[PDB]
From TrEMBL, chain F:
Keywords for the protein's UniProt record, in alphabetical order: Electron transport, Membrane, Mitochondrion, Mitochondrion inner membrane, Respiratory chain, Transport
Keyword DNA-binding in annotation: no
Primary role: Component of the ubiquinol-cytochrome c oxidoreductase, a multisubunit transmembrane complex that is part of the mitochondrial electron transport chain which drives oxidative phosphorylation.
Record bears the keyword Secreted: no
Subcellular location(s) of the protein: Mitochondrion inner membrane
GO cellular component: mitochondrial inner membrane; respiratory chain complex III
Predominant location category: mitochondrion
GO MF, any single term: protein-containing complex binding
Name of the protein this chain belongs to: Cytochrome b-c1 complex subunit 7
Assembly notes: Component of the ubiquinol-cytochrome c oxidoreductase (cytochrome b-c1 complex, complex III, CIII), a multisubunit enzyme composed of 11 subunits. The complex is composed of 3 respiratory subunits cytochrome b, cytochrome c1 and Rieske protein UQCRFS1, 2 core protein subunits UQCRC1/QCR1 and UQCRC2/QCR2, and 6 low-molecular weight protein subunits UQCRH/QCR6, UQCRB/QCR7, UQCRQ/QCR8, UQCR10/QCR9, UQCR11/QCR10 and subunit 9, the cleavage product of Rieske protein UQCRFS1.
One biological process term in Gene Ontology: mitochondrial electron transport, ubiquinol to cytochrome c
Automatic annotation (TrEMBL), chain G:
GO biological process terms on file: mitochondrial electron transport, NADH to ubiquinone
Pfam families: Tim17
This protein's record includes keyword Manganese: no
Membrane topology term: Multi-pass membrane protein
Cystine bridges: C17-C74, C94-C114
Summary of the function given for this chain in its UniProt record: Accessory subunit of the mitochondrial membrane respiratory chain NADH dehydrogenase (Complex I), that is believed not to be involved in catalysis. Complex I functions in the transfer of electrons from NADH to the respiratory chain. The immediate electron acceptor for the enzyme is believed to be ubiquinone.
Family note: Belongs to the complex I NDUFA11 subunit family.
Protein name: NADH dehydrogenase [ubiquinone] 1 alpha subcomplex subunit 11
InterPro entries reported for this sequence: NDUFA11
Compartments in which it is found: Mitochondrion inner membrane
Keyword line: Membrane, Mitochondrion, Mitochondrion inner membrane, Transmembrane, Transmembrane helix
Quaternary assembly: Complex I is composed of 45 different subunits.
Keyword hit for Mitochondrion: yes
Length: 68, 49, 373, 54, 240, 98, 140, 76, 48
């Protein structure tokens, strides 16, 4: 019986919002870009940091109500 | 300073100059000796060593 | 009675101006803060050990095992911060109201300011955290800038090739001994002020309206002491670490440098200036001048009015000076990268040009407007 | 609240706002030069309104 | 530097007059004892501290007598070991820094006694780091013994995910989800870095109350003794 | 320039305390010599005006607008007496210089 | 020289206040010039200088209302964290109303100004949010 | 000390006993107007330097961020 | 009214001190008790 980590359920519920899906779209393009260009040193951290910043901001808005 | 640009003021200084130099000299000797400044002490004819 | 005579002349009946605002409380607060620091420092000294193996352990033992030892330690740290807040507001009162024309009092003041900054620097070195060790090396290195005798002086102070136990122990001794010299210099400070009496915010001769001090400016100092204690205890009991550096809670690792090294909030303005000047020596000098420019201040007064209550252009220049002092405090915090650097360079240029050039020219213009010049 | 505050705010203020606006717009010298120059200003602004929104 | 800045979480120990949840400190101590003690040290925390926090004297001793400690010199002069005592500090997971370095692939697990105080925005950081082992994105590659934790400086922490859901079972039975475990250990580490958090806040309430009484009054006494002057009505009546 | 000087006179704010311009001068040695040479009535009005301004600054009040000091009305009484002090002062200085 | 003003809208509100305030200040100032011009062309002055002064007064006053509007709205948005909220603008519009009031030395005008101007600015925000079209092309 | 501080003449000075007068006469009655009176005589000299400090601080922050932000065109 | 008080415990300085000291002796009891009630209740369920 998988013990649901409320954090996971809150995480995809927060990824359903709009700033997270826009940053994920840049993340995808960014990662595709890095993937497409076989030899390059352009990482996706900035995009990824922006997506994680927005997502964990709205996660930390409402995470602790589900924790005993 | 207006008052200090004066004729007697200048005379006074000229008369005071020698004494001033003497005082700097005393301090100079002291510095050399006290701090053992060796750049200057090393040239001294006798105390060298 | 020859011991009570002093108090009667000085604390009980001294003729004080009737119209001095709450800013004149601040110096008395500084004296109270000094005692508070000394008292808390004494109760830190009964358990602190100035050994590099045991200094961090002794500080943690104070915070964890001594009864209310965390209270005395954080009272000491936030009282140093309160000391610098009251010191900056005292200096700002002296600059705004033309109190620097009491030249001997002003010079004993800037000597006290230098002594307090040195005491706080060595005290911050004392807990032997990561931040203390890298901070010490940094400023001790500042001395190396000296053109010829720099290296020796640095090594002397360090007491060895690099800061190590040799430093910590002598920094404990010097940090212990300097607040008593500060107390003696404060007696000379109040002494040179007793010979003149205080100034008033209008800047005029207040000899026609003076009142006693016991019932009028004593209860006022008691109220200011109570408000300062309220701010100090809400700094200690509610936001204790808000005025600290988290990296000081790690032990001193000579091998690694905490990346976000920065001087405490009060040294920042100076830090900015130092960083601004490209030349190392230049920075050190400018830094010193930053504090010393104040001493130089009584020779720059070119106005026929003592205070800035009736001087609006110099009021505007004064608040621009407070503004870019706050800017220099912010820049120090910011890391080395565009455009923080340029602001720092300008802010320092504007600071020195407002104090050196703009205020006497503005005072000449203000005297011309009143048909005095 | 009745009478003064609810009559000075909604009913009276709107009375004043306009009254004052008519006073400035209708206080005209009657001289032709002034009036005409205003035609000049207009041509200029309209020239621009077209220009910037080209 | 360029680093993800952990968000603000609605903790309970943040309330101006709010104390730490002590059941969470007990659970986080269990988390440290079963997971974090293998590599991290707690040199300035000893069992006695717990007494009066989340454990009783007898219980604490239970805890103490559940570990082994060296005991100075034998009468023979031969160092020996003894049942842990309420006066014993928490055991070293590595006799010397080198040991830890070696075992932890060159990484020195920092003493988690003051980690929360030593890390900027510690409580958050801790939670974030322990719960921030996300996959490295394209363009970044980490060597062995490294992990892409956005929050960790350099996003390359030697520690591996130290909390897998249901890593340990809470004696209280509260579901041991990774998060419930990270929140408990962040509360505990917080407590560790400031065992007096609760006691202090009490004084704070008291101080405010006192100032709230004394401050207003001192003002009335000052305004009494200053009313005299503040009502002075000067007047110049030259001989004329 | 005259209107801008009146605006600066209002912005300086010593007229709101009932002060004159010469009341606001910093008492240096020359200013105290000029004050000592004042007649008794002018000195008494100056001391009363300074005391009233100090009392108003104590209570953080100003005078009513009808009681302020009109720029046009302000009288530069100490000025005449001051010039002399400066003149005499300079003469003496020059003598010593030479 | 128009790609500029538009920029105000492009970046999300509450962000890059510097630009916002600069742009808003210019628009007000531009209006100031135009307004002074009509004010000088008609109801002329007495001396060239007197009129130059007017122009300045009107220009500055208008530039000010421009700035505070820009500053208040941007800051409110940032502080209130509501990137897109009509109220933010209202706070700003009110601010402009007050400024204007001060420059005219009248509390009452500030009252008139706070509500009317603010309401107007708020409506601008709504307008942008709801994609209201002003001066529309004939599409019948 | 007192007695030798200054020379004034014909300046009468009336006063009242502390217990005879209200402690906070019209404290909020005129206090508010006065505090407001005060703020309007000093706000134009004090506030605009701190306003442009706020603008420079924000600007610096933003500018710094943009400085840090990555230019995609850079890599090509 | 206070008058009765004043004439009895607040007019003679010695008595003034007496009332102060005695009051302070009890105030601590009351303050601590009242204050604790407030703090504990705020954090009820978290203590111990
Ligand atoms: C605003 C609403 C209330 C109002 O209108 O009050 C009018 C009143 C002013 O009335 P006023 O008749 O125009 O002025 C005469 C003063 O009341 C005469 O009193 P004062 O203001 O000269 O009092 C001396 C001064 C003494 O202040 C100090 O000693 C302050 C010391 C420095 C600050 C603390 C140090 C640390 C700073 C860190 C930064 O105290 C204050 O400034 C206020 C003390 C408040 C105590 C707590 C009251 C609750 O406003 C205040 O007193 C402001 C503070 C209270 C609100
Ligand atoms: C191609 C298409 C081209 C279309 C061109 C449209 C141009 C419209 C402008 C006016 C045209 C010529 C005209 O008849 O104006 C005479 C008018 C005569 O005024 P005046 O003889 O100088 O005033 C006599 C005293 O000096 C008055 O004493 P005062 O000056 O002391 O009173 C004003 C005082 C106190 O002010 C107040 O209490 C009231 C403030 C009202 C502000 C809003 C006024 C405009 C409202 C438009 C809606 O504040 C000031 O002193 C000035 C402070 C700085 C204010 C800067 C405002 C710039 C507004 C620019 C508006 C541009 C058009 C929109 O000249 C102007 O002032 C022009 C601007 C305002 C015109 C009056 C309002 C007409 C609005 C009709 C609708 C326009 C918008 C919708 C379309
Ligand atoms: C903090 C309070 C600072 C008060 C400063 C001041 O003006 O003096 C208060 C006042 C000033 O005088 P007062 O006139 O305000 O009040 C005096 C009251 N009678 C007339 C009865 C003396 O002095 C005192 O109240 C002295 C009180 C002595 C109490 C000694 C025992 C204390 C026991 C504590 C337990
Ligand atoms: C902060 C704003 C404080 C303030 O209220 O500013 C206006 C005030 C007006 O003072 P004034 O015009 O003399 O009138 C007072 C009696 N009505 O002007 C003043 O309050 C003057 C206060 C003088 C001290 C101000 C100190 C501010 C901080 C300065 C820090 C740096 C000091 C220099 C360091 C080098
Ligand atoms: C021309 C004035 C017009 C005023 C119109 C307002 C109405 C006036 C009539 C009604 C009365 C209202 C209330 C009056 C209060 C007191 C009087 C007053 O405010 O006067 C105006 C005041 C003083 O005027 P004055 O000093 O003569 O002007 C010289 C300007 N330098 O001047 C001011 O307050 C102006 C202050 C401007 C300050 C600008 C500072 C800009 C630069 C700041 C830099 C800060 C640091 C930047 C970073 C540096 C490092 C990178
Ligand atoms: C939400 C509720 C909003 C309610 C708005 C109510 C507007 C009308 C209120 C009353 C206005 C009024 O009475 O105007 C009279 C005023 C003075 O002129 P009058 O009274 O004709 O002559 C003086 C006496 N013989 O004449 C004036 O000053 C102008 C009158 C304007 C009339 C209203 C215009 C509204 C325009 C909206 C755009
Ligand atoms: C609901 C609406 C409530 C509006 C506020 C109600 C109360 C208004 C008030 O009490 O003041 C009326 C105002 C008083 O002003 P007063 O002291 O006479 O000084 C005038 C100096 N010119 O009356 C006046 O004399 C001044 C009138 C000023 C009118 C213009 C104010 C700005 C209008 C901006 C409109 C929108 C512009 C952008 C679109
Ligand atoms: C119990 C769930 C915990 C918690 C709360 C933390 N850890 Fe560890 N840790 C380990 C090692 C080798 C390191 C150093 C790695 C490196 O420096 O590259 C760490 C580090 C930490 C930190 C400090 C982070 C920082 O910025 O310095 C923190 C806050 C932290 N950990 C929390 C090793 C281990 C373990 C052995 C595999 C396990 C178990 C834990 N850690 C458990 C925990
Ligand atoms: C003679 C009286 C004093 C004594 C005996 C004393 C003693 C001590 C001791 C033992 C410490 C180390 C404990 C600690 O980490 O807090 C310390 C720290 C410190 N002291 Fe003092 N001190 C005295 C006065 C002062 C004064 C006057 C100042 C202010 C200028 C000051 C500023 C500091 C600071 C800033 C620290 C560092 C606090 C920290 O760890 O954050 N001390 N002092
Ligand atoms: C060590 C910290 C200091 C202490 C304890 C201290 C103490 C005091 C005290 C008690 C007073 C008299 C009360 C008052 O007017 O506020 C005073 C006044 C004064 N101090 Fe200081 N002071 C300190 C720092 C300084 C500094 C650094 C300066 C110089 C910038 C300075 C310059 C003055 C001046 C000029 C006055 C006269 C106030 C006036 O009449 O306007 N003080 N100080
Ligand atoms: C009326 O003029 C005076 C005055 O006469 C005195 C003595 C003081 C001194 C007041 C204090 C209580 C400050 C204490 C000063 C010290 C000497 C600090 C030394 C500290 C000790 C450890 C003792 C003033 O502040 C003051 O102006 C308000």
């Amino acid at each position: 019986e998988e013990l649901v980590d409320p954090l996971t359920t809150v995480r995809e519920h927060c990824e359903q919002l709009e700033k997270c899906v826009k940053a994920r779209e840049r993340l995808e393009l960014c990662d595709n870009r890095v993937s497409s260009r076989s030899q390059t040193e352009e990482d996706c951290t900035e995009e990824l940091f922006d997506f994680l910043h927005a997502r964990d901001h709205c996660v930390a808005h409402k995470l602790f109500k589900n924790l005993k | 300073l207006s008052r200090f640009l004066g004729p007697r003021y200048r005379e006074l200084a000229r008369n005071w100059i020698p004494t001033a130099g003497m005082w700097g000299t005393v301090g100079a000797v002291g510095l050399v000796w006290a701090t053992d400044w060796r750049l200057i002490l090393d040239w001294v004819p006798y105390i060298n060593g | 009675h020859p011991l009570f005579k002093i108090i009667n002349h000085s604390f009980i009946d001294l003729p004080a101006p009737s119209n001095i605002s709450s800013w004149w409380n601040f110096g008395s607060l500084l004296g109270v803060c000094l005692m508070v620091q000394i008292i808390t420092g004494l109760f830190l000294a009964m358990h602190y050990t100035s050994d590099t193996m045991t200094a961090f352990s002794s500080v943690t033992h104070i915070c964890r095992d001594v009864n209310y030892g965390w209270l005395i330690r954080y009272m000491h740290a936030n009282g140093a911060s309160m000391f610098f807040i009251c010191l900056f507001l005292h200096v700002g009162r002296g600059l705004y109201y033309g109190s620097y024309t009491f030249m001997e009092t002003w010079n004993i003041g800037v000597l006290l300011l230098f002594a307090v900054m040195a005491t706080a620097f060595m005290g911050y070195v004392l807990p032997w955290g990561q931040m203390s060790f890298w901070g010490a090396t940094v400023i001790t290195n500042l001395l190396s800038a000296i053109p010829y005798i720099g290296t020796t002086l640095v090594e002397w102070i360090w007491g060895g090739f690099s800061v190590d136990k040799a430093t910590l122990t002598r920094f404990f001794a010097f940090h212990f001994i300097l607040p008593f010299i500060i107390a003696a210099l404060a007696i000379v400070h109040l002494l040179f002020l007793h010979e003149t009496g205080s100034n008033n915010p209008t800047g005029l001769n207040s000899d026609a309206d003076k009142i006693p001090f016991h019932p009028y400016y004593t209860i006022k100092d008691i109220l200011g002491i109570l408000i300062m204690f309220l701010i100090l205890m809400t700094l200690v009991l509610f936001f204790p670490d808000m005025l600290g550096d988290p990296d000081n809670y790690m032990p001193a690792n000579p091998l690694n440098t905490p990346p976000h090294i920065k001087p405490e909030w009060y040294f920042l303005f100076a830090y900015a200036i130092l960083r601004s000047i490209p030349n190392k020596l230049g920075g050190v000098l400018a830094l010193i001048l930053s504090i010393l420019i104040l001493a130089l201040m009584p020779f720059l007064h070119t106005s026929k009015q003592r205070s800035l209550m009736f001087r609006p252009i110099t009021q505007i220049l004064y608040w621009i000076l407070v503004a870019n002092l706050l800017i220099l405090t912010w820049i120090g915090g910011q890391p080395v990268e565009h455009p923080f650097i340029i602001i720092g360079q300008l802010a320092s240029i504007s600071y020195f040009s407002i104090i050196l050039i703009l205020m006497p020219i503005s005072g000449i213009i203000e005297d011309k407007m009143l048909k005095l010049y | 609240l009745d009478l003064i505050w609810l009559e000075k705010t909604i009913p009276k203020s709107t009375s004043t706002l306009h009254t004052n606006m008519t006073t400035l717009t209708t206080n005209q010298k009657g001289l032709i030069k002034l009036y005409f120059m205003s035609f000049l200003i207009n041509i200029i602004l309209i020239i621009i309104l077209y220009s910037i929104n080209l | 530097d360029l680093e993800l800045h952990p968000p603000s979480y609605p903790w309970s120990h943040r309330g101006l007059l709010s104390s730490l949840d002590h059941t969470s400190i007990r659970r986080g101590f269990q988390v440290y004892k079963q997971v974090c003690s293998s590599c991290h040290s707690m040199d300035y925390v000893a069992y006695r501290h717990l007494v009066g926090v989340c454990y009783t004297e007898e219980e604490a001793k239970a805890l103490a007598e559940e570990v082994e400690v060296q005991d100075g010199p034998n009468d023979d002069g031969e160092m020996f070991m003894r049942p842990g005592k309420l006066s014993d500090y928490f055991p070293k997971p590595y006799p010397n820094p080198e040991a830890a370095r070696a075992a932890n692939n060159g990484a020195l697990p920092p003493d988690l006694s003051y980690i929360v105080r030593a890390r900027h925005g510690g409580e958050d950081y801790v939670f974030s780091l322990l719960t921030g082992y996300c996959e490295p994105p394209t363009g970044v590659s980490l060597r062995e013994g490294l992990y892409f934790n956005p929050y960790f400086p350099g996003q390359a922490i030697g520690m591996a995910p130290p909390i897998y859901t249901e890593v340990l079972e809470y004696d209280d039975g509260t579901p041991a989800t990774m998060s419930q475990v990270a929140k408990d250990v962040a509360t505990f580490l917080r407590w560790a870095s400031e065992p007096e958090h609760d006691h202090r806040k009490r004084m704070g309430l008291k101080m405010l109350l006192m100032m709230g009484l004394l401050l207003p009054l001192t003002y009335a006494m000052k305004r009494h003794k200053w009313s005299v002057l503040k009502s002075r009505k000067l007047a110049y009546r030259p001989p004329k | 320039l005259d209107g801008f000087r009146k605006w600066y006179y209002n912005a300086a704010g010593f007229n709101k305390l009932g002060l004159m311009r010469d009341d606001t001068l910093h008492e240096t040695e020359d200013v105290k010599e000029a004050i000592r040479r004042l007649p008794e009535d002018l000195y008494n009005d100056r001391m009363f005006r300074i005391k009233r301004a100090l009392d108003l600054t104590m209570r953080h009040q100003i005078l009513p607008k009808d009681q302020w000091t009109k720029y046009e009305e302000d009288k530069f009484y100490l000025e005449p007496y001051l010039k002399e002090v400066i003149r005499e002062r300079k003469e003496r200085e020059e003598w010593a210089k030479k | 020289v128009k790609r500029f003003f538009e920029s105000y809208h492009e970046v999300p509100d509450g962000t890059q206040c510097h630009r916002k305030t600069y742009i808003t200040t210019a628009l007000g100032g531009i209006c100031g010039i135009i307004g002074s011009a009509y004010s000088v062309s008609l109801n002329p002055a007495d001396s060239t200088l007197e009129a130059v002064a007017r122009v300045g007064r009107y220009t500055f006053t208008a530039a000010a209302i421009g700035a505070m509007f820009g500053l208040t709205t941007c800051v409110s948005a940032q502080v209130r964290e509501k990137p897109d909220d009509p109220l933010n603008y209202f706070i700003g519009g009110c601010a402009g109303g007050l400024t204007l009031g001060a420059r005219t030395h009248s509390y009452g005008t500030a009252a008139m100004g706070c509500v009317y101007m603010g309401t107007a600015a708020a409506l601008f925000k709504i307008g942008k949010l709801e994609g209201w079209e002003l001066f529309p092309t004939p599409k019948v | 000390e007192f007695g030798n501080l200054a020379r004034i003449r014909h300046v009468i000075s009336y006063s009242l006993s502390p217990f005879e007068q209200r402690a906070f006469p019209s404290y909020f009655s005129k206090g508010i107007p006065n505090v407001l009176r005060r703020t309007r005589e000093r706000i134009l000299r004090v506030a605009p330097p701190f306003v442009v400090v706020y603008l420079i601080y924000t600007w610096g922050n933003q500018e710094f961020e943009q400085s840090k932000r990555k230019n995609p065109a850079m890599y090509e | 009214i206070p008058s009765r008080l004043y004439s009895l415990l607040f007019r003679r300085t010695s008595t003034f001190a007496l009332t102060i000291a005695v009051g302070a002796l009890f105030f601590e009891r009351a303050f601590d008790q009242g204050a604790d009630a407030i703090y504990e209740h705020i954090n009820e369920g978290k203590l111990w």
